[model samples]
Target chain A: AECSVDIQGNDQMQFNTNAITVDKSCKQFTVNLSHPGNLPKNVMGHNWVLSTAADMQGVVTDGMASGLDKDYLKPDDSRVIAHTKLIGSGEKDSVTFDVSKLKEGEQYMFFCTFPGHSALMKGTLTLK
Target chain B: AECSVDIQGNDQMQFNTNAITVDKSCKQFTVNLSHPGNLPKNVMGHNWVLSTAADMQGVVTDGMASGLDKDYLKPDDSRVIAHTKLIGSGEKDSVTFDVSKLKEGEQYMFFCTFPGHSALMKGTLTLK
Candidate 1:
């Protein structure tokens, strides 16, 4: 089986989960994100971006200016460890990254970089 | 009484209020922000910033690089209509701006520009 987890985002401005554990034994991990809401992307878009706890604000801040077409993430941003495309209601997206990128004892954050979404849709990612 | 409002921030990553109305009759508007939490500024600081709704993202993104000593705001950033100094628990700051700067029917946002604080400490400002 693939080393992956499914996450859900909705119109209520929330994520189905606030924390995810990545098994250290896996050489890679993937996150699959889905939106069951009926609303359109422009109104309630969501994306998953992973970075160090220190990098979250910087990535999200720059992502906001990148606009929705760019998945609310800066293009070629060195700070981004991984990210999924911005999705709306009934849409789905996923991203996979090498497990080696995450360091033990380092805190990492995953958040939706939509203009105001980060307020409620961020989570912690840690190695188990 | 002066056309002014007092706002509060706390260590819990919250602002006491999420909306404010500015009476149109006043020539200037002032906001006084106080932090009542016991946390230090580097860990839990807050500030109030005013700008057009469209400008909020750009300002916050750039402010993250400005560092806390600069109050997390870019130097001489023209898009900022008004801002208070970053304050920690038990500290206070305030800013006053000419009411003429706000146009009728335009939307404004007031928020704390701290790294992750904006996610929960933002509010809408409207002219009445």
Candidate 2:
């Protein structure tokens, strides 16, 4: 694929993409997120957040405290490598980050931090 | 074997009890919930909620919308057969509901509604 990929979130607390591959040659990577669900943001919002697998729990823990207004993310959290804006039905958002930030052997995770959404809307990110 | 059961929740996002049986002769059923983890309420709260197996997803969806201040449950949600107040580390709570509300062959569910906790903190309930 290109340097970017589109992922979809639905009303059933599912994400169309469960794994993502980032080509090592690319200087930057992008994630385009779309929500086709019928529910509103407050009820079924979704956002894409990137971090190391080890930081996933910590990020989600603090994100809950940040609340929805912050897209369920802590303000300026350095642990977050990248993130897309929170979206509702028929809404979309994207985030692009430098590929250099990723280490060749480190495991990465991308997930939605919308309260309970993280439990189901998570996936693996690997370098290829 | 008793009408009462104790469930423990921990930082690992697990519940000690995965299945519970209520003696059919009991007039009432009780659930005693305890959280022994170090995390505080806002970060790692847990609660016991009872509802029909079919109503689980609906109750959890609505509960997330209710936010944490309401103990992650909608106010006066009739679908909720019984529930305990949300508790944090070193805290405990219990709920007792008439056993008559349960049917002999019906399947019941008990879970925590703390954001993502329900994904792993759930169990099956039945009357024996």
Candidate 3:
């Protein structure tokens, strides 16, 4: 539980939780994102993206505005420190990142960038 | 043409146009929001919400805080002058309101309240 977290995104546009903490001792941390509902990715696709609290909006904006970038799944984006692939109903995806990339006391945020999801599918991350 | 308007919401989180015109002669006007894309309502949900330009942000801000069960709207929100139901790909929703509700020279806005979608799924309505 200290090195990784499990979260959910359903057909109702809800997330299982909105807060996470990364243990300072772990060399790497993983976020496991699961979609337990029965909806197509095109309709209810969800992904987990990590970034500084300040960059969340910019990433969401860019993710929403990009044509080919659909669902903000662009792994190449520099603003994205870590991200899981877009998952659909009954699907699961996870992302692991070096814990060293996260600075203690620095605020981080994780959210779903599936077009209109950022508002509700977000949580704060703490580096312990 | 003055009594009804047709609009489209796509999978790309886009609307066909960002402006609408209503003629003063119409006693009742209808705004129809349709999704031609192939996604479901929960993931690519969309709606047409109308309010004063000044109220747009407030309505959107509050609505985004709500859940999909409420169709992303606070119950009986007075700031909402008119709105269609949240829809997904291939679905359609329509709302007909009295043209008298249109105040002269007032700036009115229409948008989808699907979380982060207010950025692009919006338009301005003018009285003629």
Candidate 4:
């Protein structure tokens, strides 16, 4: 069976979930993100970016340094497995990557790449 | 003539302009902020808040400590004259304050109150 997940973010600097489990049966997985509010991107933009838990902080620091023209994520960041473009209210984005990206015992995280939003908007990802 | 300024902010802790002048003849003024790239709030959230220049630092510091629930602003922050809510990509918001709020010598500033964002996402405001 195919497995997919939908998540939502808002101007509140929050994500609907902090943890996600990917089914082992899926060869590839899709993650969808949405913002129901009506704010524009420059202020409250949101994106779903995934990386190893260990790589999370480093990636965000680099992203912040990269600047918004770079979507707050480092270009060609090896630590990033997949990411969706940043979007504002009433907007949606999605990303799909091979399930193999996850190692058997390694943990991962998904979060917004926006400059300050990351502090409050993040969730865990695990391969099951 | 009516004057409206367009400003841009990115993932970097910076804004395109640090000073803005409002025309004296206008009854109201508008400031538009945009983020061309994609990044969500919580990671890179930004907002345009207006307050006296002297009140700027205190407002932002209080906003940061206020958390996301209050949109990084103290609820009914007496020092604030006007503010646009937080926003993200593909989205937009604007705030118009009565022109009478300004005096000839008062200096106002606009910025994103989201935690660390205030350090880089800020600009000056003045009434002509």
Candidate 5:
């Protein structure tokens, strides 16, 4: 109901949130991500990334090439409307972007960019 | 170099191959997949699937609901030209589909349908 959401990614590549709705009253929105699993970053690291569904592939393909140092995102990738820092087990990260960056008619999705975790670590992000 | 290639998957969800070329002369192609790391199937199972690049997402998303018994593949999914059985660590499986199913110009991709493995456990499959 608020302008922010808390999501979790576990050791098994599963995300706690499969769908999130954005509130219209907030000018900016936030996602608080937590990794409580025991696996190391390389094995099960995760970061939340936001972009148009059409740009997901390009961002992810190139983000992967960007490697872990850039949190699996290309440096200043315009395609990336917003993203949270990569977090290892027992750690948390969050990101906030202006709601105006999102359009009412468009649909957005949230996913993790930890190597191969996207399949199970994704959800629909909706603007209300 | 031969008619087939042996690839490995690990507990960290990494695959050994990013690109594979299909020899024009071979009547069939085989991909030998092995998971050498010590982990249970639910945590780190791996399997090999072959299909046109266009069908990857449809097959994978549906396969996740197929559960482990079907090797994470839709039962007799037509899009799946060929696939191997799912295997846990220290096990191996292979699939050899007819070469005629592959065309010269179309692009094929090999990947694991183990939930999120496709993001990293994937390679371009080309017919020479």
Candidate 6:
């Protein structure tokens, strides 16, 4: 995973990684998400959503209104830099975003928007 | 609550009623499902899927493949008698199937097809 990171979401509503750093030299970055839990998509679904730390809460709140089929995130949301599909047990998905969009001093963040999932599932990302 | 019966699905993946009786005289039978649990639709999501007990497993299988947000069901499946929207905590949904569709000795069944949910979230529906 040179330009990408592998992330996990489990049945306990937790993510495997809490922090990520992106190299400014990379033109694009990707996040691969997987559900390592035994529960199904509806019972214990998970997704990886990316946005600014400042915009994380609003994206999560709006994703709540949007619901699961959209992976709990709004479609073509400009606030979102990238995101993976909502996945269930043993499922996997991936998403790539242009790294050029990231800027210095901007606190980029990533998390799952599956309701209360972000509290323990969020992570910080920075451009190196 | 006359021709329509209220059913409950909880966070523990158990339904309030294990058996349902519908009056054959009613033109249409309605099953109104309410979630007494405190989880959102993506996690602990539930939907009332109706089909013959024989078709139940297949519908569940298809829905599992279909994923959530589309009601956890195969759309326009001939085997499905009726179904409700995928519902979460504090949510309510119902489906009406004509009593004429239920014949004697058909052994109809209703359950949530939210992957791994039918095991504890299913029940029998009989024509009275």
Model no. 6, DockQ: 0.15
Error of 4 at B76 (Å): 12
lDDT of 4 by residue, B1-128 (tens): 26677776775556778878888887888877776656565555577888998999899888877866787789999998888777665567766777888888887888878765665577778887
lDDT of each: 0.85, 0.87, 0.84, 0.80, 0.82, 0.83
Task: Please report, as a residue range, the 10-residue window in candidate 3 chain B with the lowest summed lDDT.
Answer: B36-45
Q: Write the per-residue lDDT of candidate 3 for residues B1-128, one digit (tens) a residue.
A: 66898999987678998999999999999978889865678767899999999999889877866778889898899999999999988899888999998989899999999866787789899998
Q: Every prediction's TM-score for the first chain?
A: 0.96, 0.97, 0.93, 0.96, 0.95, 0.95
Position A13, candidate 2: lDDT:
69
Each prediction's DockQ against the real complex: 0.04, 0.12, 0.20, 0.15, 0.10, 0.15
lDDT of 5 by residue, A1-128 (tens): 38999999986688887998998788999999999866556546789999888888788877776776777789999988899888888999989889999999787878887655675788888788
Q: What ordering of candidates by lDDT runs from best to worst? A: 2, 1, 3, 6, 5, 4
Best by DockQ: 3
| Model 5 chain A poorest ten-residue lDDT run | A36-45
* Runs with alpha carbons beyond 4 Å of true place in candidate 2: A5-16, A30-122
Q: Which docking category, incorrect, acceptable, medium or high, applies to candidate 4?
A: incorrect
lDDT of 2 at B112: 89
- Steric clash pairs (candidate 5): none
Candidate 2 vs. true structure, TM-score: 0.66
Against the true structure, what is each candidate's TM-score?
Answer: 0.54, 0.66, 0.58, 0.55, 0.55, 0.54
Model 6 has fnat of: 0.31
| Residue B80's lDDT in candidate 5 | 87
lDDT tens digits by residue: candidate 6, B1-128? 66789999886678998899888779998888899857777677888888998999889877876665567788788999989898889999878878888897789888988766787789998988
lDDT by residue (tens digit), candidate 3, A14-36: 78988898889999998888998
Task: Give per-residue CA lDDT, model 6, range A20-106, as digits (tens).
Answer: 999988899988888895667766788888899889989998887787678788878889988888888899998888988899889
In terms of lDDT, the poorest run of 10 residues in model 6 chain A is A37-46
TM-score winner among the candidates?
A: 2
Q: Which ten residues in a row have the lowest lDDT in candidate 1 chain A?
A: A36-45
